[PDB]
């Protein structure tokens, strides 16, 4: 239920 | 039977997933802005304002036996707390298409979703590289103190590398020595490959030389990648939301909440 | 309630771990000078001076069959006991931001800490590769007896290998035969890749050709990596400390205690 | 309180281990003569003389059905039994530094030990490549029957190859078929490395090319490194011993017991 | 309580 | 590990004791004023004022077999209740110095503490001799009813004796008789020192002949040492207090709360 | 816990 | 107590 960014940063 | 009423969740978990992977892969290939700069961690949907920081002036640090120099960046007299905009696009899904996929037991057609996500990512790149100019946001090409480096002759092989050098030197004398990221317009980016110069530029950058369609005319920016010079605050990432239903169809919105904050305006150098 | 009372260590656990991981990641991902130097064991910050041994003008001999003839022995020409400087950067933290992170469960903004760590590491590289002339310290590129080698025709493909081989030759003639490590300015370092020379230099060095942005327009150093030729005395590493609590804000300081001692000045050659 | 007494063993076991491994690494890194000299087995401290064999002249051997041809005998022309010298070097440890390690807890530094070991290796290489004329010993470039070959000017492409090939012709004429190794002074070694000729020389030698600091400005040798041409005798390798305690300063001495025996002087060719 | 190196021995 | 986080009491009992002894010995060898002035017993930190008394006029008293003479009642002519000021000075102690003391098991360096003690003693002498004026305190040079006497013919033989004798006569006429103390500025101190004046002054005055730099270019006083004429109300003596931790340091301050009450202004004669 | 005195009057 | 060559030949 946390934020869980979807598309991870490329860097 | 389900399409006879104004449905809450028209798609089940299978096609919701399929949509999520579709959008995430399309955007991941499409994006050229995130690769340049590190994102700030996910704040959440509620957050709408973040502290916009400015750090004009250089305090490179101190060397001392006793640590008495007392150096420390000064907060700006008034914190501006810039607000977080919303980047979005919309696409339709036909109810007959949904029911056909359900009865055929076949993958659902998400071409409209992929197109909407690609357009939303392109608009994100436009926001990153250029200010909105109606919202008042500040872009990489509209920032105050861009450190403009003149572009004289550019087609001789030495000149292309020389201009990047000179930009590096300007960043040096302005105080940033961190790793460099280079973003180039498509024209001069393709042109630079004539003499193998691209690899040398990439090595000088040590973090990546990429190309953006949105840059118009000659457009090269060298930017210290490091945090405390530029950041991307993400309130919520690329998602797909259901915009009710009209005319029995199903409109959806590819959604993301981003804000590019340039903490130190001297960390960028345009051409 | 936490606004009103006085207490230690504002940030709690998770946040302390976040800060520590951020600073150590920044340090490791930024340090280049430490790549070619073997660090003296961690002193613990209690020690503030180290023996500045200078093994110069050494004497050969002692070929006898029964231990006669004697020797001059080995000792530093003169014990100096130079002191260890402190490299630090102060950043500030608002209390409303901390309590917003506490309540809303958003990640705390560590951009200021990351920037302070990066700038402190950059200052460390500055100290390592250059003396300051204000605290009586000495760097690699300004030392006495640096065994300079002329670097004409660097642009030409043959020259870069030549200059490197000549620098090696000088090191050998003087004494040091060690596997070498090179450090180059982004101009030179970028230029050699197009030629193809970088593979040659890598094979000659056998321990690494590296890029350091702290150097001049056209300069570089070839060194012997071995211990007893260079040392990085360490008293205390990249750490974050709390500068008390003034006016309800929260100042922190990123800290390093390093000193580069070149015991044998012949192991360096500049370009 | 060892500073008020004639201390018997100032250091303890891990310090002895550190000293031993430091001198071992110094030796392995520094020895260049031991790369081309096969070493006669470790004799120990007790042995002080070895048979010096002279194999002047070539006995081709015999082939026959019955095995009775009475071929020329191969044996030492005259047994000599010259003794094995001692190569040593003295470094020093200060008593206040010892006390500091005992209580202050600062780690001991043995950079003086490594420098002394390097100088001892340097003297060993000097002894191997050159006689001392005081103990009646012999080196590579001073022996009688060296088959000297003139050296054409280098910095000209193919001059180095022509010279080594000539020297090889001279060695083959004297009936030595052994694979060779080329040891060159740094100056002309760099001159050879300028034109990329080291590939041809290395593949012709197949035993490697090595550079020696001791060799004069313009000097070089080619040797057949196989046994029965040259040997190195080793009574005792690099070992660090305690020379009592005078002055309350603790002196130590690195020892090595070596002797080069060029059993076939025709196998070495100078330039 | 010891020295406890943090960023070091990157070689 | 304790250095990183600020603490209320960084120093241990041993360092506190060292600080206290150092400041005590500096005050003992520095406070010229205390040696003459008798000190009222300390009151504590809580008390901030004392009853400032006046005793204008003298009642001789009487002697009788039974004691019926109704002698004049002796009491304060006017209560004032002055407030007690604070004399203080700030010195700085470094965290690395404390850590080095803890590691080496050596006494802590208190040079700054000694300097602060010296300056605080100087300020106390300044307050005693000349009033601050802004707060309206009254000192030896600022007293009312000082019985000013000429000092002509200074540096002439016998001049000092004449001046002191005249002052002594004036004090006797007022009715003050006890052991006299003479305090002089350095200039006229040496001017009488040159030819035997000091021994005569020491005898006739009978308590002291002190020198203070706090006086002006050419001035002096001949106070009556005995109590009731003058006193020194004390709240708290020379102490060291911790003013928090700032910028990774330890600022401390030497503190006293002293108040000179000249109960009988006729007991003084200035020059 | 005596209030105490530190440096007594030199007198 | 054996011979125990310490600096073994590089060969």
Curated annotation (Swiss-Prot), chains A, E, G, H:
Residues 5-11 are annotated as: Probable targeting peptide. The encapsulin and a cargo construct (an encB-encC-encD fusion) can be overexpressed in E.coli and in human HEK293T cells. In HEK293T in the presence of 0.5 M ferrous ammonium sulfate nanocompartments can be detected and used as cell markers. Coexpression of this nanocompartment with a larger nanocompartment from Q.thermotolerans (AC A0A0F5HPP7) allows of expression of different sized iron-rich particles. The encapsulin shell proteins are not seen to mix. Disulfide bonds: none annotated. It is found in: Encapsulin nanocompartment. Cargo protein of a type 1 encapsulin nanocompartment. May help nucleate Fe atoms in the interior of the encapsulin nanocompartment. Present in about 92 copies/encapsulin nanocompartment. Belongs to the ferritin-like superfamily. This is Encapsulin nanocompartment cargo protein EncC. The gene is encC. The chain holds residues 119 to 129 of 130 of the full protein.
From Swiss-Prot, chains B, C, D, F:
It comes from the Bacteria. Keywords: Encapsulin nanocompartment, Ion transport, Iron, Iron storage, Iron transport, Transport. GO terms for biological process: intracellular iron ion homeostasis; iron ion transport. The keyword Lipid metabolism does not apply. InterPro entries: ENCAP (IPR007544), Encapsulin_nc (IPR051429). Transmembrane segments: none annotated. Disruption phenotype: Does not form fruiting bodies. Decreased survival when grown under oxidative stress (0.5 mM H2O2). The 32 nm encapsulin nanocompartment is formed by 180 subunits; monomers form pentamers which assemble to form shells. There are 36 pores where the pentamers meet as well as 3-fold axis channels and dimer channels. The N-terminus of the protein is inside the shell. This is Type 1 encapsulin shell protein EncA. The gene is encA.
